[PDB]
Amino acid sequence: KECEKDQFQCRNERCIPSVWRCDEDDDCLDHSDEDDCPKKTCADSDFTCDNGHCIHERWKCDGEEECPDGSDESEATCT
Ligand SMILES: [Ca+2]
Ligand SMILES: [Ca+2]
């Protein structure tokens, strides 16, 4: 059995909307839609821009705005 490309397949093989994957409610009844869910946020090793965009730490404060809000280059950010 294989679900639509817009679906998550539970271990019991129920299909759910993929939008229900990792939404912190067990829709599968086997909890499989909520297993091994990615970290909600950036890598701790990445710089998190103010707006939440993730960039690699190396590009923090190096003259070019890799953050869309430019917070990797802000006065505040670089001390
Ligand atoms: Ca869910
Ligand atoms: Ca930069």
DSSP codes of every residue in 31-78: SGGGSSPPPSS--SSEEE-TTS-EEEGGGTTSSS--STT-TTS-TTT-
Superfamily name and number for 39-79: Low-density Lipoprotein Receptor (4.10.400.10)
The two structure tokens encoding residue 76: 């505040």
C-alpha distances (whole Å) from 25 to each of 3, 16, 30, 31, 36 are 20, 12, 11, 8, 14
Experimental technique used to determine this entry: X-ray
For 1-38, CATH number out of 3.30.420.40, 4.10.400.10, 3.40.1190.20, 3.40.50.970 equals 4.10.400.10
Domain with CATH 4.10.400.10 in the chain: 1-38, 39-79
Q: Name the one residue in this structure whose structure tokens are 């297993």.
A: 35
Residue 35 assigned as binding residue: no
Element (H, E) at 7: strand 7-9
Resolution (angstroms) equals 1.9
Q: Cβ neighbours of residue 76 under 8 Å, at least 6 residues apart?
A: none
**Separation of 56 CA from ligand 1 center, angstroms?**
30
* Long-range CB contacts (within 8 A, 24+) of 27-34: 33/8
**Separation of 65 CA from ligand 2 center, angstroms?**
4
Q: Cβ neighbours of residue 40 under 8 Å, at least 6 residues apart?
A: none
Residue 33 assigned as binding residue: yes
C-alpha torsion 20→26→30→36, nearest 10:
70
Our CA angle for 61, 67, 45, nearest 5°, is 65
**Separation of 26 CA from ligand 1 center, angstroms?**
5
